[PDB]
Design a protein around this ligand. Structure first.
Ligand SMILES: O=c1[nH]c(=O)c2nn[nH]c2[nH]1
Ligand SMILES: O=c1[nH]c(=O)c2nn[nH]c2[nH]1
Ligand SMILES: O=c1[nH]c(=O)c2nn[nH]c2[nH]1
Ligand SMILES: O=c1[nH]c(=O)c2nn[nH]c2[nH]1
Ligand code: NA
Ligand code: NA
Ligand code: NA
Ligand code: NA
Lengths: 295, 295, 295, 295
């Protein structure tokens, strides 16, 4: 037998950082969960019990805290690139670092119409994420994403004209509820190293904001022919607005809300044009994915 | 042996309702999870296999949908009271109904600075809940709550002057992070029946809004001496603003964020006044509760 | 305003203890999650910011570890009683302690047909729990439970003869699937104090084992007329076998498995006597509760 | 813009099947959660709103039930291969099907020392899974796995001799607790089609059993030098016992249990050789992965 692939590290490292502006008294908080996995010349730890090649996962944890102390943690694309580069530069036998960061929302509270200097609310479990792969001699690959953005529209969604055969019971419809949890990932062109990532720092927050805005507006405004058609429109717009993105991937559940026929009860009308009360379905769910790139 | 207590019904009934304004084209959605448990002269279903006394749980489910079709579902205090009253009036041998409702957030989207007519976002997993107990001959008892409101302040929290003995290692502090998930319940005076609940309908949404606003403002503005002291201030204000509330109960976890001593690494200073990076603790957590009523 | 009730403490304290037999080399592990909430003359911490009455929750955490170091942690009824008694005896102004313990399964592995001395498996998320309320001058109240015991029988369950009215669509049946997650609690007679709890130590594990065995056998063997009727039979037997139990409470979801009519597809027969493939329903679910005590 | 990749289908389809032996009266149940995603000439549904190429996800759901009605559902490798093959053969424009199956445990109850004919218990949340990729013209690729197997050993684990630098605080140890949740995947050689999968049917259950047995025995018996070294030993043995496996992948969290220094309290000794009470850590956790293949 032989080791074909190996990676190891520390997962679920929770980190909080506060920035305090001494002039204005305003404080800003960041909270993240970080995972770092390393690859390199470490096969002997598996095959020969040679621990000398192992940077202990506990040390990886310490490094994450030290790195957060000495560097900005925002945008996460930059922090991830700093953290990954550290491992490949510090350890001769480590040749790749894989850094995953999930950013949790702490939104400044408005109290009596004014932004509070040091109080925050978790407004939704929507996350902003990064995956950064730093590979010695091959640069830095970054995938940025938003996830856990849950939306619903109560009309202006249709689904008709699909294939009908002996396995089909679904009725065509010209008016249905559409609800999903949005998972959207944009993949940046490969960066040569940390200097290049630093040079594009302003684009990271701006592109996240654009991806979010395009997703919300397109969902709200499209008279949707299907999840497939609406999601493609979203991806097309993101690619048009940021030339440094190579691909956009969406993964969307179709969270179904079923009509309830109540006509058995005193002829109560609750279907088609008369539908008011619906039964949300926990499972099963449609799952629709697409990766859109450039011509 | 004898049956000392029994209740049964249907849990986890998901319900969605849409309201469509034909004039303006504006749609409004409501989504809830409902549980209804019944009590009454049903002991024989347990002791003698006498199913004749059982209103099937499936029928309870149907009733929830029918009731939502024929009545407003907001405020939830009213819907719960209608639903509970139905069971005690319809079935001679059912003498109490216990209705729990969890309301999920669907907040209207703003697209380009204007409210969208039919698109919604789940902004946080904060819930608005009701517990309604309808007991034949004893009226309607309603407990309203908010839950899952997660907040953090990065300064203006202290904790010193507590008991110190041979079990104590905790250092006194004059500046710490305070974070919690708020669970707040207000209990209404007993209502004689549905007519009285209807007469107070406007107070339900207003009191929820007040409870939320008082919670947020007090948390943000109090230079907190302890969770105990800050939570009491919240409860006192709610009772002062709504005379029809008898008690307010808060249940608050103290979600700890620990300093990380990095001084072992190149004398790095990250404690006390120099603390910037902290480790959020998933467990254990403090848990502090209080019920505040009138003199 | 006035404080009507208050309690506070530490939740989610994870504890592991190992016992090592030096003679045989056999090791035995215990893992628990513990919550301790205190009550007493602590109102001033809420109303006057008087922290002098507060035993810090951090100290409560330390006490749990120290107590586990110096005492047996099994049976949990005994450990809970020791832990609760500590607080009411040590602190003059603390008058009640409420201790909740969840015991996690670590079952010794059998390797090649023999019990391994120091290797364990988590066989299911079934828990054994205790709630112990120690109240100064009123003794020790203990409720023991098992929870998370998930079972299914594929036949020998019926449900017919229930009330039928204009809200009813459920068909009567003489053969259905019955599946539930068992939550069963037995409440002990009040104990005068720790000496009395110690005197009954052997009864705690034996009664847990009996409750489990009665639950499983009754479920498997009863040709069930309803959840109500089968659960009553379980409770009756437990009360008959342990005279020191005052009441038994069961709380049982009815986890539904629906027939799927496939007759639209080539006349495929999959209902009634021909039913082979079913759709498990995640929600809603029936919820049936009963508390059984002595004549 | 262009569609680079697309797949869509139905997720979270819960399925139960019962087998009834008329001769013996013995019933056997199977419960699974199934996901099927399709690929093929479907780009126009995304780019042109052309739904004619879409096999509706609802139809995919129906197909899963129909297929389970007409075929054995065990071993899951066979059922997955039947289900995937169906889609590529039935629809000219569908060229790949991706089938994921999670099998839930329903273990026959022993009542009074004998196997019960129709009563079952969920003994642990351990799962047996399959991923089957059926690609037109490229055969059938199957990855089989077990997951959610949670184990702990209280001694006979060591970790010393790792890299020490200015980021390291971890002490070397010759005796620690080792606990993990096992995720193990074995990848079969490519099969030419359904006939070949059928020819190997007996190997699927046998290899699952072997993988499980090797995992448990190796964990229990290895005086472990690291997670890396123990996991490699497991993978090596599986590859030796089944020649039709090409690779074995393990992904193992290192779930830490920390010593608690109690020496501040009356000189209590609870570290090193005296350690009895430990604090399980929910996070962070080590994560160690390896893929082992043939020379
Ligand atoms: O088994 C281990 N492997 C590792 O890589 C490691 N790092 N810290 N502790 C550890 N234990
Ligand atoms: O066992 C049952 N008890 C009930 O009360 C019920 N209601 N619907 N189905 C049911 N099954
Ligand atoms: O606000 C607090 N209240 C308490 O009771 C406590 N105990 N430890 N830390 C604490 N913080
Ligand atoms: O938008 C949809 N896309 C689909 O592929 C589908 N299949 N069923 N319903 C559906 N809705
Ligand atoms: Na390197
Ligand atoms: Na009545
Ligand atoms: Na006392
Ligand atoms: Na095909």
């Amino acid at each position: 037998s032989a080791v074909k692939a190996a990676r190891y590290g520390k997962d679920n490292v929770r980190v909080y950082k506060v920035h305090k502006d001494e002039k204005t008294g305003v404080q800003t908080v960041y909270e993240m969960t970080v995972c770092v996995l390393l690859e390199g010349e470490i096969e002997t730890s598996y095959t020969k019990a040679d621990n000398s090649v192992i940077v202990a996962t506990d040390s990886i944890k310490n490094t994450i805290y030290i790195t957060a102390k000495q560097n900005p943690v925002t945008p996460p694309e930059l922090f991830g690139s700093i953290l990954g580069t550290h491992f490949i530069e510090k350890y001769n036998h480590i040749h790749a670092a894989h850094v995953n960061i999930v950013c949790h929302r702490w939104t400044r509270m408005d109290i009596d119409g004014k932004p509070h200097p040091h109080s925050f609310i978790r407004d939704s479990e929507e996350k902003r994420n990064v995956q950064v792969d730093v590979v010695e001699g091959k640069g830095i690959d970054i995938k940025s994403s938003l996830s856990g953005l849950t939306v619903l529209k109560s009309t202006n969604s249709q689904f008709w004209g699909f294939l009908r055969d002996e396995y089909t019971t679904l009725k065509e419809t010209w008016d249905r509820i559409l609800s999903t949890d949005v998972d959207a990932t944009w993949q940046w062109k490969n960066f040569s190293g940390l200097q290049e990532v630093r040079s594009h720092v302003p684009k990271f927050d701006a592109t996240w904001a654009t991806a979010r805005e395009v997703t919300l507006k397109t969902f709200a405004e499209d008279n949707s022919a299907s999840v497939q058609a609406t999601m493609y429109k979203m991806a097309e717009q993101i690619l048009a607005r940021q030339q440094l993105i190579e691909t956009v991937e969406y993964s969307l559940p179709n969270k179904h809300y079923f009509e309830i026929d109540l006509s058995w009860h005193k002829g109560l009308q609750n279907t088609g044009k008369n539908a008011e009360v619906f039964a949300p379905q926990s499972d099963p769910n449609g799952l629709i994915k697409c990766t859109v790139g450039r011509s």
